[model samples]
Target chain A: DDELLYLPVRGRETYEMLLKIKESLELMQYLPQHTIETYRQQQQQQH
Target chain B: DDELLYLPVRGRETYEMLLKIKESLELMQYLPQHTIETYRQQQQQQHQHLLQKQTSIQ
Candidate 1:
């Protein structure tokens, strides 16, 4: 949805690029949520 | 959805804490497509979240 949350970023495919970072890309606030969600799913599945 | 992109991490509070003498955070990764939709939302309301998770948990 267009009304959903998003994240601001300053990096690239690697850390060196991220640190020297001048420009940036817009990510999602949910990326973290879903990442945690992924971990949660895996743990539940493994257990 | 079980079909979206995400970022991985390891950090906390601030950059010093982020890259502590004994710690490191991956910092980032490509986010979900929903974000693209958000950013693509009317150019006027299009603003970055500007928020950081600070840690893996929250």
Candidate 2:
């Protein structure tokens, strides 16, 4: 089992901003508590 | 061209919070400026209008 989930994103800058905002929110404890699989999903592929 | 990135997340609740916070930031213009080739291509996307319109719908 894994302990982390991933948000499928698409850029370096967007990634940076998201991380910063998350850090900021965490400082304020304004976000909801986290749990693995609470947001988990399976990886699928298509040809 | 395309870009792909992933941020480790934990829960749906947390995800929702991030969306809300992002929306709030946008309202204040407190967020950074965007570019088609800059802050673009995030499949985990954001920014939408309240009413339906037909001009540049993305």
Candidate 3:
């Protein structure tokens, strides 16, 4: 594992963004189908 | 430092996927053995480019 993976990471903005993404993905774990649907919807929305 | 981070990205689809997830997390370099093992198992079960593609697609 990279050490940074364990670190809290310095700086507020980057760290916060990372934490938010991490939290979002973690939340997805509890809702598998929804997570997949959300991802697909996001792709569609992007298009 | 941002210079596309210089990894061997290839093809339109793969490149597009990589662009999608590039902002999320830098790919963990200097991965330890255990980390490698866990990811390796993940690789074996899931298709070869699946995790990579997911990261790319994200």
Candidate 4:
């Protein structure tokens, strides 16, 4: 579910940067494709 | 506190890539400065990291 799959973040200013970065990350596949899950989770968990 | 915040993830291959990305994020600042809070919140709730997700050891 997309709902549960939150980007999991905070800080409005930082949110902007993160959104852009996330946008970029979304565009780049293959290199990020297979690794997407872990990346999301790592980030989702906010490590 | 840097006590909480977990890299909630799945898949080993994906895990490796995320590690690199996280590492890279650590290097970058300003652009990611304030956004980090939101990002952490997002991830913290899972969506954002909470009290339970914190890890103490390596």
Error of 2 at B44 (Å): 22
lDDT of 3 by residue, B24-45 (tens): 2322222345664564555446
Ranking by TM-score: 3, 4, 2, 1
Top-scoring candidate (lDDT): 4
Clashing pairs in 3: A1-B32, B17-B56
Q: Rank the candidates by lDDT, best first.
A: 4, 3, 2, 1
Q: lDDT at A8 for candidate 4?
A: 61
Instruction: Between candidates 3 and 4, name the one with more favorable lDDT.
Output: 4
Q: What digit string (tens of lDDT, one per residue) describes model 1 on residues B1-58?
A: 4343433455555544433321112222345456545544433242342222221235
DockQ agreement of candidate 4 with the native complex:
0.06
Residue B39's lDDT in candidate 3: 49
User: Candidate 4's residue-wise lDDT over B1-58, tens digit each?
Assistant: 4354676788999989877666455433323445555544554464234422542231
Chain B of model 1: TM-score? 0.23
- The clash number for model 4 is 28
Give every candidate's TM-score on chain A: 0.33, 0.45, 0.53, 0.43
CAPRI-wise, candidate 4 is incorrect
lDDT at B29 for candidate 1? Answer: 32
Q: Candidate 1 chain A: worst 10 consecutive residues by lDDT?
A: A19-28
Q: What 10-residue stretch in candidate 2 chain B is worst by lDDT?
A: B47-56
How do the predictions measure up, each by TM-score?
0.21, 0.25, 0.33, 0.27
